[PDB]
């Protein structure tokens, strides 16, 4: 009876999972490379004198 239904479901799930696989493998290839910056702030907290520039 059921060979056609079996094969159709098999192919559908295979295609879907194949698309998920071809995205997931490359996104795990680049998943620690998805970092960002820190944006450190100086705030001149370590100064103990006037700057030699003409602005100050």
């Amino acid at each position: 009876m059921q060979a056609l239904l079996g094969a159709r479901a098999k192919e559908s799930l295979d295609l879907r999972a194949h698309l998920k696989q071809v995205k997931k493998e490359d996104t795990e290839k680049e998943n620690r490379e998805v970092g960002d910056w820190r944006k450190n702030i100086d705030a001149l907290s370590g100064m103990e004198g006037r700057k030699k520039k003409f602005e100050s």
């Binding site: 702030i41 100086d42 705030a43 001149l44 907290s45 100064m47 103990e48 004198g49 006037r50």
Partner: protein, 57 residues
Amino acid sequence: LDKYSEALKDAQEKLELAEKKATDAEADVASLNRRIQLVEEELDRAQERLATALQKL
């Protein structure tokens, strides 16, 4: 006069240095308040986004 003038250049220099220290310390009170508010805002936003993430969860 020289002693008062010198005591003054020194009180005044110590003042320019103390005022500078205050200016720079204040520049940092402000830079710290900016970072505190940027971080508190990111925190409140992290918490808004958390509350949202939790609501979306």
